Design an enzyme around this catalytic site. Structure first.
Site, PDB file in Angstrom:
ATOM      1  N   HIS A 179      -1.698  10.956   5.032  1.00 35.06           N
ATOM      2  CA  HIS A 179      -1.012  10.330   6.151  1.00 35.06           C
ATOM      3  C   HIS A 179       0.027   9.297   5.735  1.00 35.06           C
ATOM      4  O   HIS A 179       0.831   8.881   6.581  1.00 35.06           O
ATOM      5  CB  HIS A 179      -2.022   9.703   7.100  1.00 35.06           C
ATOM      6  CG  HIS A 179      -2.664   8.448   6.589  1.00 35.06           C
ATOM      7  ND1 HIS A 179      -3.856   8.460   5.902  1.00 35.06           N
ATOM      8  CD2 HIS A 179      -2.300   7.144   6.693  1.00 35.06           C
ATOM      9  CE1 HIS A 179      -4.202   7.216   5.603  1.00 35.06           C
ATOM     10  NE2 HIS A 179      -3.273   6.399   6.067  1.00 35.06           N
ATOM     11  N   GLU A 204      -7.067  15.021   3.983  1.00 32.26           N
ATOM     12  CA  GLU A 204      -6.324  13.787   3.775  1.00 32.26           C
ATOM     13  C   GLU A 204      -6.070  13.467   2.308  1.00 32.26           C
ATOM     14  O   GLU A 204      -5.580  12.364   2.009  1.00 32.26           O
ATOM     15  CB  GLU A 204      -6.998  12.594   4.458  1.00 32.26           C
ATOM     16  CG  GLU A 204      -6.600  12.514   5.936  1.00 32.26           C
ATOM     17  CD  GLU A 204      -5.131  12.138   6.119  1.00 32.26           C
ATOM     18  OE1 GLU A 204      -4.666  11.148   5.500  1.00 32.26           O
ATOM     19  OE2 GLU A 204      -4.429  12.821   6.877  1.00 32.26           O
ATOM     20  N   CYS A 234      -3.385   2.213   1.708  1.00 31.34           N
ATOM     21  CA  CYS A 234      -3.837   3.583   1.615  1.00 31.34           C
ATOM     22  C   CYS A 234      -3.058   4.301   0.520  1.00 31.34           C
ATOM     23  O   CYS A 234      -1.867   4.029   0.312  1.00 31.34           O
ATOM     24  CB  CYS A 234      -3.664   4.312   2.942  1.00 31.34           C
ATOM     25  SG  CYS A 234      -5.069   4.011   4.132  1.00 31.34           S
TER      26      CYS A 234
END
Ligand SMILES: *[C@@H](O)[C@H](C[C@@H]1CCNC1=O)NC(=O)[C@H](CC1CCCCC1)NS(=O)(=O)CCCOc1ccc(OC)cc1
Length: 165
Positions: free
Chosen positions: A31, A55, A131
């Site tokens: 993402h 992911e 992230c």
């Protein structure tokens, strides 16, 4: 003690970070990948072998992007109870290695997305923009990377890394 070269693999990318596993392989969390971009590190998308699922995203480039690096082992998560470091870089330049005791690998539904993830309990916290940071641990002499940062619960003490298929 992660050495400087290991830290130099952590790389600013999209809305977070990624990690150079080797001179040609770069991993991140799906993402954070910018979506209207047609070039990564000067390379066109046509030159990158892309593998993505749950992911976890891997790019394999057609040319040595980081010839200074050795290849290291990328594992599908790690054994429960393994202590790992999350090699967090902040936009300021600060290095924040977070110790985390890894729990079970599992499929997870996080903010509407399927994550092939591994939970972990911290032993400071994580923030938006962290992230893609790598989860690493030592295998005797060497370092092993086994996940990329994806989520942290409402609470703050449990973290999730996406892991390869
Ligand atoms: C990085 O983008 C960011 C890091 C995170 C921000 C707040 N503190 C952090 O460590 N990650 C997120 O914002 C994450 C984004 C989703 C997007 C789709 C793909 C998965 C990640 N959202 S969140 O705020 O971390 C969701 C909080 C709930 O966390 C969990 C964890 C486990 C779980 O399994 C039962 C459910 C929910």
């Amino acid at each position: 003690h992660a050495p400087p070269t290991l830290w130099s693999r952590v790389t600013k990318f999209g809305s977070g970070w990624g990690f150079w596993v080797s001179p040609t392989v770069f991993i991140t969390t799906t993402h954070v990948v910018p979506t209207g971009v047609k070039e990564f590190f000067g390379e066109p998308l046509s030159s990158i072998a892309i593998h993505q699922a749950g992911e976890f995203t891997q790019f394999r480039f057609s040319k040595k992007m980081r010839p200074d690096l050795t290849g290291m082992v990328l594992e599908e998560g790690c054994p429960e109870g393994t202590v790992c470091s999350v090699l967090i870089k902040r936009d300021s330049g600060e290095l924040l290695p977070l110790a985390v005791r890894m729990g079970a690998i599992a499929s997870m539904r996080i903010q509407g997305r399927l994550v092939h993830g591994q939970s972990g309990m911290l032993l400071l916290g994580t923030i938006p923009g962290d992230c893609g940071a790598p989860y690493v641990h030592k295998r005797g002499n060497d370092w092993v990377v086994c996940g990329v940062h994806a989520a942290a619960t409402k609470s703050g003490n449990t973290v999730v890394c996406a892991v390869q298929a």
